[PDB]
Structures are given as C-alpha cells and as structure tokens.
C-alpha cells in the first residue's frame, strides 16, 4: 500500500481532530496558493417549498441523477398517492424536499465520488425539486465555471473529506467549507471564460443532438421482429398482464414429458398460442441441435493470475460476445481445451433473473487468447444450413426468446432462474426460409451498428470537454 508518515501536529488541522488515512493522505505540506470557500461559492441553508396541490410537479433522488449530471426527474401529482410511490410522498411530507434557486450547483452528500454534481442553469423552465441530500452551493464566479472546475478537476479533494464512519461514504457541508482550491485553476479558467463556455456549449449541444436520436440496445431487436412478423406491440404486453390462466387435467400432458403443472408453464403455453396465430414457420429446435455443452466454472479471483473466465454480464441483447473477461482462474481440469470459446460458437445463458435468462450470443470477435466459459453458459452447435446462428441469438434476445424463457425456465430460487437442455430441445421457434433470414439480421445489424457508432461520439465529446478543461486549467 503506502508508507505515509505524518507528524502529530497535522491532526490539529480541521475542527474534528480526525486522523483517518484518507484525510491525512490529502493534507500534505503546501507552498502554493490557498483560497477558501469565501471567494468562490457559498452554502445555502435548506428550506421547505410551497408545493401546489393541483399540478404535477417533479422530484429527484440521488439515483435519479447520473455521473454526467443529467437529472431524470419523476412526475408526482398528490392526486395519485399510490402505494408504489407512497414512500416518495411520505418523505416529501417529512420535509426532505427543496427547490433550487436557478444558478446553484447541487452536490450529493452520500458517496461524492460518483460525480453527482448537477447544474441548475439560469435560463431554463420546468422547475424540479430535490432531496435534502443535495447541497445548494450557489456560486459567485459564474455557475458554469465552478461546475466545470468541480466535475473533472477538484475531485481528488472533495472525495478526500468524506466520512466513512462504519457505513456510508458521506460528504458534509462543514467539511465542504474547508477545501483549499488553488487560484491558478480559477484564475486561468476565468481568464479563458469568454471562449471556454462557448466551445463547451457547442460540445454539449452536439452531445444533446446525439442523445436525441439514441435508442436502446433492446428495442431495436424488439421492433424488427415486431415489424417483420406482423405482430402488434400493444397486446402481447397486455395479454401478459392478465393473470387468470385456467387449464384442464388433459392439457397437462400435452408436450410435457415431465408432467409440469406450474402456473408459469401454463401461461407460456397460452402466450405461444398467441405469438404463432399468423406465423407459419414454426419448427422444433430439437431436430436442428447437434450437441450441447455447459462449460467450466472453477473458483475465480477478480483481476488475478490465470486463464480468464467470462460471466453472465458479457452476454448482451445483440448476439455478440462482449469478450471482456474480469475473473481469472488458476485451476486445471485435464480437459481445459474443451472450453476455450473460439470464434463462431453460440452461447445461450443458463442461470439469471426471470427476464435475463435465455439471452444467446455469437462469438464474432477474433481472440487468440483462450478464454473459458462458465457452467452458466450452454454451447449450442446447430446445423449451419437452416438456422443461421446469429438469427437464432437475435430471436433468443427478442420477445420470442423472452416471453418463453420467462415462463418455462425452472428453479425454486427465481433470482437465479435456470434453463435446461429439455427446454432447448422442446422449443418451437418460428424458422422462416433462409431467404427471409439474413434480412431481419442485417437490418438489425446496421441499426445496432449505427447506435454503437453514436455511442462513442457521445463519449468523445464528453471526453473532449474534460480534456479541454484540463488543458485550459493547466496553461
């Protein structure tokens, strides 16, 4: 670790004589400028707002804010008072709500390292409330200047005055009033104020433009299968809502081969009767599967030494392996070569939540390193003449592969719901001719490729802002 040495005196600093390792790591002897909280920002005391009980207002927790300072408020009304959001209304009535004064820079107290600093810009509308866990810190040297000086830089020191204290990492306003902000940062940043705000505004306008057309990685897979099989999107999520499935004794045996009479099995059978009313392409998967393996999941150490191992997090809704291993093992099995992925395989996911079970992926990346897949995967070697593995993975990640594996997979612990070879072999998927396939794929491929192309531009301008701030504050 570190062999830091300090001298009693030091712990004299700050009105709590504290001597935890982090604070004393942040102290250091200083020779340069000091400043204080005086010639900069100013803490604002909290207050109870006058909520109007006639219109839908907004509210914002700490989880509703992101590391990029983008609040995602929820809309409450005081005419609903539903027991699902009753906690929010109760904490509002308690007095855990305030309203920023259009120019302050709210800072989260709990765990301040996750950049929850947000800006309430001057020229704006649709006033949003906030939790007392946020610190109104309204500045005197222009909000944007202090916001950008706090987000990227002045972060190794706001995070070094947190109270660990047998639990939550937490920031306190009193400690926040003690940081030793250098002047060269603010001096240089205000010196270039007239153009820094301009080009940063241009960059964030481009980011907003990219975000305006950004689409989720699952809806794309959800729409093409919905727009190609001519199934309306507003009934299979409305038929899945009603829960009064009624079956007879005779229907239990039909295609069961294990006599399973759970409720979810019967609802799966009901939904299958709806997803295939007009589609005439369904063929049993059992006759298109040639083998099935599981994998090898030894004990693993995170960021250790040995052969890397994949996890369930590496399977995404696009049928492409993430191939970004984290765990690494050092055990042997005398047959390790049987589980070293290799390009071209199809990996369905066995073991996950009731909604993330069955997600398949094709290893489309060329890797010269041997990477083991766990017992939580199932490798499918299908005939590459009728199924087109990528299409099968996309189908498994589609609502076809969700409304089935959500209701057929087994286990008493529905937090680690697992599938088995029986459900794979007894799966009546719709397989259209090879002409129809490679059209759903390809369309989905280009749409997701475009969505990924505008996913690094966002984290290119969001990095350009940071590097520009760093360069200007260092010149």
């Amino acid at each position: 670790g570190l062999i830091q040495r300090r001298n009693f005196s030091t712990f004299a600093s700050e009105p709590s004589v504290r001597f935890d390792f982090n604070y004393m790591k942040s102290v250091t002897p200083t020779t340069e400028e000091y400043y204080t909280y005086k010639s900069l920002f100013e803490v604002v005391p909290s207050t109870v707002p006058t909520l109007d009980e006639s219109e839908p207002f907004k509210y914002a927790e700490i989880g509703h804010v992101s590391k990029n300072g983008e609040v995602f408020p929820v809309t409450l009304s005081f005419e609903d008072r539903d027991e699902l959001n009753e906690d929010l209304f109760k904490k509002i009535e308690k007095g855990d709500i305030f309203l920023p004064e259009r120019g302050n820079i709210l800072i989260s107290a709990i765990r301040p390292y996750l950049n929850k600093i947000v800006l309430i810009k001057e020229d704006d509308k649709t006033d949003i409330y906030f939790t007392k866990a946020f610190i109104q810190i309204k500045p005197l040297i222009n909000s944007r200047i202090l916001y950008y000086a706090l987000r990227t830089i002045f972060s190794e020191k706001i995070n070094a005055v947190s109270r660990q204290g047998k639990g939550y990492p937490t920031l306190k306003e009193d400690d926040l009033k003690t940081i030793q902000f250098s002047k060269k940062v603010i001096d240089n940043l205000l010196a270039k104020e007239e153009e820094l705000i301009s080009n940063i505004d241009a960059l964030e306008k481009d980011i907003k433009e990219l975000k305006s057309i950004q689409r989720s990685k699952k809806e794309i897979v959800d729409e093409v299968f919905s727009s190609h099989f001519n199934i309306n999107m507003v009934e299979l999520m409305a038929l899945d809502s009603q829960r009064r499935v009624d079956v007879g004794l005779s229907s239990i045996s039909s295609l069961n081969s294990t006599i399973r009479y759970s409720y979810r099995w019967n609802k799966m059978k009901l939904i299958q009767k709806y997803l295939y009313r007009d589609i005439d392409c369904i063929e049993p998967l059992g006759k298109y599967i040639l083998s099935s393996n599981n994998g090898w999941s030894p004990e693993s150490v995170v960021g250790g030494e040995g052969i890397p191992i994949l996890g369930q997090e590496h399977l995404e809704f696009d049928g492409v392996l993430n191939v970004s291993p984290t765990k690494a093992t050092t055990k042997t099995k005398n047959n390790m070569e049987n589980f070293f992925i290799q390009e071209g395989d199809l990996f369905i996911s066995r073991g996950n939540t009731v909604d993330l079970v069955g997600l398949a992926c094709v290893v489309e990346t060329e890797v010269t390193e041997d990477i083991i897949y766990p017992d939580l995967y199932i490798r499918l070697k299908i005939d590459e003449k009728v199924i087109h593995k990528k299409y099968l993975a996309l189908l498994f990640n589609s609502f076809f592969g969700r409304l089935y594996f959500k209701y057929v997979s087994k286990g008493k612990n529905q937090t680690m719901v697992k599938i088995s070879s029986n459900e794979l072999l007894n799966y009546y998927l719709p397989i259209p001719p090879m002409e129809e396939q490679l059209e759903i794929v390809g369309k989905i491929e280009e749409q997701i490729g475009a969505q990924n192309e505008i996913e690094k531009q966002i984290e290119e301008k969001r990095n350009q802002i940071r590097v520009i701030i760093e360069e200007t504050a260092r010149s």
Partner: protein
C-alpha cells in the same frame, strides 16, 4: 373520570358515618373535623384525592381506625440539595400511643406503577424525618391504591415494615420488599407475605386490564432482555418455560393449596433463590408429563427452566414477582374488550424475538388467504349444521401455530359473530353450539378437540403450547415430537386421540392411513436433510421413503391424514411444480389427490428471510372408488403401451437394422410383413407415437418414418427406473391417456403483491392482490359512535364555557385596573381571545365532521347495519372515507368475502373452485 370513581362516590354516599365525601359533579372533597388537617382540601384535584378519601373512609369505617389519630397532609420539609424541599405525606394512621403505625402515600391506579422510583423520596425519607424530629416510631410504610373487585373496592398496596428496612437501599436489595398487601383492621398485618392460597376470597387475578398488561410487557422487555450476553431468543424461550410453569400452577392446584408460583417471603427476608429455582423446576418437570407429555423419565431430569448461567436467578425472581398475581389460565373477564391475554403474548413475540432464516414464521396474510380459499367457514357451517361437529384441522410442521391460532379466530368469528345467520337451530345444533362455544369466557374450548398441530422443535413446541393456552385453548393435542413417525407414537393423556389410530390401506402400499382429519394446512420446510439414522427409520411407511428428497414426504404424509375428501392447502416451493426430479411426487398428487387450485406467490412473501418462490396448492383427496378407477385405467393403458412397444420394437428390428423375419415374434406383428399391409403398421406407429407425430409425415414411408421418429421411439419406450408403484408403464403415455378420459378443471392464478413488504427495518403496505379488507364493518354500534361524538363535543363545549367565564372575569378585572397591571391583563386578554377563536374554529370543524357523520350513517348504515347495495364494498367513496377522518378509529380489519363482484384472487377462488 373512571367508573371506579363512580363506585367510590356511591360507596361514600352509602356510608353510615359521613367522615369522607366526594362530589364529581362539583369536583369537591370533604372530610370530618375529627381528623387533624394541616391543609384545606375542598376540591378534587384528580384521582389521588378520590383515592385518599376512599382510603380514609375505609380506615374509619371498615378498618376501624380512630379518625382523631388520623392525620392528613402533614408537612415534612427536609434538606434536599442546595435548598429545602417541602414534601407532604398523604395519610398518617397512628396507634393509641401516638406513634405513626400506617405511613400511607396515595397515588392514582395508573400512577401506582411508574412512580415507584419516587418512593425513595416519598416514604423512607419522610419516615426518617418523622422519627428524627418527633422521636416517634414509624411502623409500616404503605404505597397504596384502590382495586375494584366485584361490587366493592379493596386496597392494593405495597406495605413495608419500616423497622425491618429503615433504609431504601435495604428495601431494594431484597427485591422490592413487601411485608403486606391489603390493610388489616385493628393494627394487624403479618410479618410473612400473605400467601395467595387461591380458590377462595383471594385469588391471583380475574379482572385484568389492558393498561396493566401493556405496562407488564414494557417492563418485562426492559428488564429480562437487557443488552448483556445470552441472546434475544434464549430469553424468550426461558420466559416461555416460566409461563409454562405458571400454567402448571393452575392445572394441578386444588382448593386451598397455597400457590407454588410465588416468592414465599417468610419473615422479613425473601426466601433463598435456590428454593424458588427448585420449586419451579419441580413444576416444570411435572409440566413435561401432562402438558408436553414426555414419557422418558430420564429426559424429565437433566432439564431445567433456565440455564442458571444465561438466565441469572434474580431475573427469575423478578419474573415470578411480576407474573405471580396474574392468572393466565381462566382469567379473561376483560370481555368488554374480549380476550386480553392473547395479544399480550403476541406482543411478547413481536417485541422480543429474532426471526431469522430458519426460524421465521409464515406471514399471517398468507395463512388467512389459505384458510379462506379452502372455504373453511362454509365447511365448518355445513359440518355443524348436518351432523353436529366441526372440522378437525391438523397442522404438521407448526412452529408457532400460526395456521392454528388463525384457524381458531376464523372459526369463532365466523360461526358465532359474522356468519351465525347460516347456522340452523334445529334444537340439536343449538345444544352443540352451546357446548362448543357460547359462554364467552371460553370461546376456544372446542379447539381442545379439533386442532392437532405437530412440531419437532422443543422450544417452538412449548412456544406454540403457550400461544394456544393464552388464547383460551388447551394445547394437550399438540405434539412436540416429529411429524413423520408411526401413528402409535402420538399419545396425549386424554381419550380422544384421533392422531393415534392407524390401519393398512390396500390402495396405498399396504401402509398406515389415519383417515380422520378434515383439512390439512401446513407450511413444510423448504429443505429437509435428514440424519443418516433418521432416514432408515422412515423407509417403512412412505412409498417414496428412499428418494433422498425428504421434504416431499410431508405431501405423502398428507395422504395418510386426510379422510377421502379432505381439503389440503399447502405452501409448497415451485421445485415441486417445475423440476423433473420431483415428477414422481407430481404423479402421486395426480393419482390420490384431485388438484383443484394453484396460486403463484411472489418472491417477496418470505423476505428478508428467503427469496424462495412459493405456490399455494389446494387439492382434495379422491374417494376409495376414484383411486381404483385410476388404477384400472392406468393398468389398461399400460397394457396397451406394452403391446405397442413390443410391436414397434419388432418393427424397428425388421426394418432399418434389417432382419430376415424371425421365429414368429407375435401373431399380429408377423401377419402382414409378408403381406405388405401398411395401414395396421401406420395405426400402430401412430398410437405408439401419439404425441411426436405431425401431419406432414403421414405420406412418408415406414423405412424413413422409423428414422425420423427414432430418438422418440427409443425414449417413449423406456420405463421408470424407480417408483415401480406404477408398474413399468411409461408415466407420460399412460398419464395422457388417463387424463384424456377423466378430466377436471384446475384453477390457476398469480399474485403480484401480497399487501405487505417486510424488510430488515420493518413492514410496509403494498396493494394486496390476494384479498381485500372489509374496511366498513357490516355491523356498527351507531348509537355508541353518536354518543362518543356527543361526549367529545360536550367536553370541548365545557372547555369553551370555562374559558369564556375566565375571559369574562379577566374583562371585569381589566375594567377597573390601572396601566401598570393593565399591560399584563391585556396580554392575557389577547392570549385568551386568540385561544377562544381557535377553539371556536375547532368546534365548527368538529360540527361539520359530525354533520358529515350523520349524513354518511343515514345514507349507508341506517339501522346499525349495512345495506345490501354495498355488501360487496365496491363503492370507492365508502371505504375511502372510512379510511379517513375519525371513522378510522372504529374501522374493520376483516377479509371481505364477496359474492357477486369478483376482482381479487380470493373472491374468485371461492366461486370458480368447487369442492366435492
């Protein structure tokens, strides 16, 4: 103003000698001039003055003490701190020699408990001052209050011989020494503690009140639990053992026979704690012979109430002191609030216990939903109406008896109170109803014969017994031994022991069957891993007693308990319904039972103890003829399957592989191979492949047809490795064929939320999908509610009138005063002016609320009932407004049983499901 104040005033007006009088109408008190008074007592300042007046009257009249010797409100200025405190004593009774004999301090009945700590400054110091400044002898220090008993009031007091304990420290070292309880006439009282020696003029207590019980629970939790060592459950089990000993000192105690559960304060010193320990362990050892009916005499020994190391003896002495004077059994005459000791031990469980993973109970909403889904109310009503009896519920695996306490509540409340209109008199049924429950003093006496829950844990067994007893029942028919044992192993002590008989059953492995229990409700453990020697002892009464899946045995056990048509409601895991390793136990349920309802409960029900998925299964039991019909169908279709498998494997041998015919495999198979007939072959293959056959393969020829369906043929031809109980016939083929002939609907449903969301911080309401509460009661005492509102508005009006008189007096004072005091006077006038305007606004608001109350009661309830237009409680306004305002106080927390509208799981499972 309590009722005992009225009784005291009536007794004072009834006294021949007018030595003490009170007036509640004027709030005044008067005493005879014979008593030397150091202060003018002419107003009733509170309950203390009334109690003091009654005490003085009792001393003069009943206790025969000279009023001249009595002294009231004598000043006893002492040196307290930097200044001189001026305390005053209430009552001083002096002997013929002038020395104070009784040093009585008067306190309110509620003040009699939390003000004991002030006794050090109220009794001992003042007595020391009396002895010092007057050279007199103080004999007895009395901390006294009134105690209502029948149409009379007696003295509930702690009396301390001041000579024995001149200091408060000596009093506290002996554990709150009390030489006497009730005042004795003619300078009496013994040195030894007056023993209870019940079954006479004196007893433990029969008129216990809610406030006393709440304070007892508070102080018991404060003292016993503490924070030092042991645990939070060990203390609970020790307290349960002590309560069991207390009940033992009510079952085996005849007339006279001084109670063994008390301090036995001989002389002036508390009897040695070891004597108390020994004479309580004797009670507890005698308790494990009729209460928990333990037969092994060596197990009776080497077993104690407390560890003596986890539970110090002083805590046991304090527990005895607190609980000695409270008759748990048979004492519930607080029936103005009905049963009062059940919620006491419910609060004991809730406040002190540490339910964790493996100790948690079954949530009450699920238990109530199960009991209602069985239609147990209608079952009990019809069981009592036709042939006078009740259902005879059993709950194996009943750790805390939640399925049995709730069953008691559900049967009593809905056979006497709610649905009593569905019980036909017909003379005999009235007599049986009177016998089962009616005196209102023992409403659960019927549950001494119809509740046969079991439990394997000794501690939880005793806790369930105490639960059962404190609710007005006897726990004789609850067994603290294993629930999976030969039926002869369950002996109670009494004659009716339904869970003892056994008999072989031809249709069930020639094994024991107790076909006597009406319904079975249970929550079996999710993972039973039996001992290597307990496993071997159970492979003689269960068909699948060797599958290493012991938790399924309970399901099989449920077949040995029901009575050919017995309702069965179980909280099973979803492995039973989903995983393949349990297929056998799914066939069993489909063979003997008549599966009728399946409900999928969320993964939040048993949180934060486990996120294990659960499903409620509601299955009946087939009669003796349905099982044999199933057996006949199974045998016939299995014979068909065997013939088809022989024909199909002969076909497969001839084709693909290729045989030059053979030695006449069978007459049928070798009659067309030479003749080339294919229709018979086609139909035979279709029958043997009744499931894996498509419509496009009809035209396909045999040679490749036997190749297309080749794995299926090699699989559907396999028999069951184990559970030959079926007879080598393939389960799937024969099961489908049987289900095709006999078929019944199976109601299935899902629950999104169960009302509650418990977590490691507390509970939290959620939208219940299982059931809806009544909110608006079917019956409401309208005159009681109107009188309560009239009383509160009259009290506020009296306060307004008093403050208006004060305002008039202050105005009169202001009219003839000068500025120097007029400043303060006008300050008072403005204070009272805004105070009275606020009171007027409050009165107007309460009047509006009252008017809305008459409006709603006349619109809905009418003559202290609820009109049938809203018996379904479908109207949002009524239930919403009852869940609001002052009507929230009365309310109603009862599961609504709708009959016409169905938007709930329970409301439709009680209508679509039909029980045979």
């Amino acid at each position: 103003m309590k009722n005992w104040q009225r009784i005291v005033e009536a007794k004072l007006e009834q006294q021949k000698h007018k030595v003490a009088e009170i007036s509640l109408e004027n709030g005044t008190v008067n005493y005879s001039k014979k008593i030397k008074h150091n202060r003018n007592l002419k107003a009733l300042t509170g309950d203390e003055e009334i109690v003091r007046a009654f005490l003085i009257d009792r001393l003069v009249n009943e206790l025969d003490y000279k009023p001249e010797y009595l002294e009231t409100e004598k000043e006893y200025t002492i040196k307290g701190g930097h200044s001189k405190i001026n305390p005053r004593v209430d009552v001083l009774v002096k002997d013929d020699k002038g020395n104070p004999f009784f040093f009585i301090e008067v306190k309110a009945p509620n003040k009699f408990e939390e003000d004991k700590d002030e006794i050090e400054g109220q009794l001992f110091a003042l007595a020391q001052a009396e002895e010092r400044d007057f050279k007199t002898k103080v004999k007895y220090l009395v901390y006294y209050t009134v105690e209502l008993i029948d149409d009379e009031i007696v003295d509930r007091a702690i009396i301390i011989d001041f000579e024995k304990y001149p200091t408060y420290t000596d009093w506290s070292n002996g554990g709150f020494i009390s030489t006497g309880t009730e005042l004795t006439a003619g300078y009496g009282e013994p040195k030894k503690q007056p023993l209870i020696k019940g079954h006479e003029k004196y007893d433990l207590r029969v008129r216990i009140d809610r406030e006393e019980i709440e304070g007892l629970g508070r102080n018991l939790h404060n003292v016993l639990w503490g924070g030092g060592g042991t645990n939070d459950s060990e203390i609970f089990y020790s307290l349960v053992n002590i309560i069991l000993a207390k009940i033992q000192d009510e079952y085996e105690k005849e007339d006279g026979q001084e109670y063994d559960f008390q301090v036995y304060q001989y002389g002036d010193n508390v009897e040695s704690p070891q004597k108390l320990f020994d004479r309580i362990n004797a009670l507890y050892k005698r308790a494990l012979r009729e209460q928990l009916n333990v037969t092994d005499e060596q197990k009776i020994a080497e077993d104690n109430v407390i560890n003596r190391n986890k539970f110090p003896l002083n805590k046991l002495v304090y527990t005895v002191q607190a609980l000695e004077s409270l008759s748990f059994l048979e004492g519930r005459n607080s029936l103005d609030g009905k049963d009062i000791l059940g919620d006491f031990f419910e609060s004991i469980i809730r406040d002190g216990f540490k339910q964790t993973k493996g100790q948690f109970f079954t949530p009450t909403p699920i238990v109530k939903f199960i009991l209602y889904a069985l239609q147990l109310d209608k079952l009990a009503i019809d069981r009592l109406n036709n042939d006078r009896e009740l259902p005879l519920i059993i709950d194996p695996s009943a750790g805390s008896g939640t399925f049995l306490i709730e069953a008691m509540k559900l049967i009593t409340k809905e056979v006497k109170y709610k649905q009593n209109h569905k019980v036909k008199s017909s003379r005999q049924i009235t007599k049986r109803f009177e016998e089962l429950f009616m005196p209102d003093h023992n409403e659960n006496k019927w549950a001494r014969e119809y509740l046969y829950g079991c439990e394997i844990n000794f501690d939880l067994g005793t806790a369930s017994k105490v639960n059962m007893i404190l609710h007005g029942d006897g726990s004789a028919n609850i067994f603290v031994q294993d629930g999976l044992l030969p039926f002869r192993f369950y002996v109670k002590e009494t004659s009716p022991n339904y869970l003892e008989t056994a008999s072989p059953d031809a249709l069930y492995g020639d094994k024991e069957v107790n076909g006597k229990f009406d319904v079975v409700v249970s929550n079996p453990p999710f993972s039973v891993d039996l001992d290597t020697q307990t496993q071997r002892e159970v492979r003689n009464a269960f068909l699948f007693g060797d599958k290493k899946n012991s938790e399924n045995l309970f399901i099989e056990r449920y077949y040995q308990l029901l009575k050919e048509g017995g309702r069965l409601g179980v909280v099973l895991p979803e492995s039973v319904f989903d995983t393949t390793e349990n297929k056998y136990i799914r066939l069993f349920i489909f063979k003997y039972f008549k599966v009728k309802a399946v409900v999928s409960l969320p993964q939040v029900t048993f949180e934060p103890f486990t996120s294990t998925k659960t499903s409620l299964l509601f299955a009946q039991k087939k009669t003796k003829e349905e099982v044999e019909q199933w057996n006949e169908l199974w045998d016939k279709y299995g014979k068909e399957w065997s013939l088809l498998k022989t024909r199909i494997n002969d076909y497969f041998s001839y084709f693909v592989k290729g045989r030059p015919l053979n030695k006449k495999w069978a007459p049928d198979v070798v009659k067309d191979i030479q003749e080339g007939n294919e229709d018979n072959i086609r139909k035979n293959i279709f029958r043997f492949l009744k499931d894996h056959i498509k419509e496009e393969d009809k035209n396909l020829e045999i040679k490749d047809l036997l190749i297309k369906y080749a794995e299926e043929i090699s699989s559907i031809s396999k028999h069951e490795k184990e559970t030959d109980v079926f007879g080598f016939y393939n389960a799937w083929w024969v099961f489908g064929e049987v289900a095709k002939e006999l078929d019944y609907p199976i109601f299935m449903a899902e629950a999104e939320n169960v009302g509650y969301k418990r977590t490691k911080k507390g509970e939290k309401p959620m939208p219940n999908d299982l059931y809806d509460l009544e909110y608006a009661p079917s019956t409401l005492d309208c005159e009681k509610v109107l009188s309560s509102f009239d009383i509160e508005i009259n009290a506020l009006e009296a306060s307004k009138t008093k403050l208006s008189v004060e305002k008039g007096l202050l105005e009169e004072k202001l009219k003839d005063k000068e500025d120097k005091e007029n400043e303060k006077i006008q300050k008072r006038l403005n204070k009272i002016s805004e105070l009275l305007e606020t009171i007027e606004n409050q009165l107007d608001s309460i009047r509006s609320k009252k008017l809305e109350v008459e409006g709603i009661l006349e619109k809905y309830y009418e003559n202290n009932k609820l009109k049938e237009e809203y018996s379904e409680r479908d109207d949002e306004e009524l239930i919403n407004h009852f869940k609001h305002g002052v009507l929230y106080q009365y309310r109603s927390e009862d599961i609504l049983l709708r009959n016409k509208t169905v938007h709930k799981i329970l409301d439709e499972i009680r209508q679509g499901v039909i029980w045979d």
